[PDB]
Design a protein around this ligand. Structure first.
Ligand SMILES: Cc1ccc(Cc2nnn[nH]2)cc1Oc1ccccc1
Length: 133
């Protein structure tokens, strides 16, 4: 029941400061522009201890499956090869990606009927708000 409130299909409805976040991460111009247009559907499911998060959009379709606290390899939508660990901290899913001596954290939170995604790279945060699809 660990992620009950996250499970479901969610659609992006707003984004703030995402271009700057992507710049800070190192994403190039053309990828930033096409990625920034995307309105993904995020599909979260749980089967036993395995959590799956899919992101489907015109830009890219991605899928990760993981166990909390157990590091895994991820190829991000912008093609970084990262080492990821996802944990639950006080009801927030905290996803840390490490690559090339850099780090970024993506937090997913349930707030009212929304799922809020906060992405941080050094001093730069972006907030992406999803609603149930
Ligand atoms: C690369 C990347 C970094 C951070 C985030 C933030 C995020 N995670 N979940 N919701 N938003 C998304 C990223 O990838 C995508 C960008 C656009 C469309 C599809 C995927």
């Amino acid at each position: 029941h660990m992620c009950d409130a996250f499970v479901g299909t969610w659609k992006l409805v707003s984004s703030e400061n995402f271009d700057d976040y992507m710049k800070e991460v190192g994403v190039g111009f053309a990828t930033r522009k096409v990625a920034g247009m995307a309105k993904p559907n995020m599909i979260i499911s749980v089967n036993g201890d395995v959590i799956t998060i899919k992101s489907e959009s015109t830009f890219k379709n991605t899928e990760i499956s993981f166990i909390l606290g157990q590091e895994f390899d991820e190829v991000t939508a912008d093609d970084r090869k990262v080492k990821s660990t996802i944990t639950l901290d006080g009801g927030v899913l905290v996803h840390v990606q490490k690559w090339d001596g850099k780090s970024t954290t993506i937090k997913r939170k349930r707030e009212d009927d929304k799922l809020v995604v906060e992405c941080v790279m050094k001093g730069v945060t972006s907030t992406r708000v999803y609603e149930r699809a």
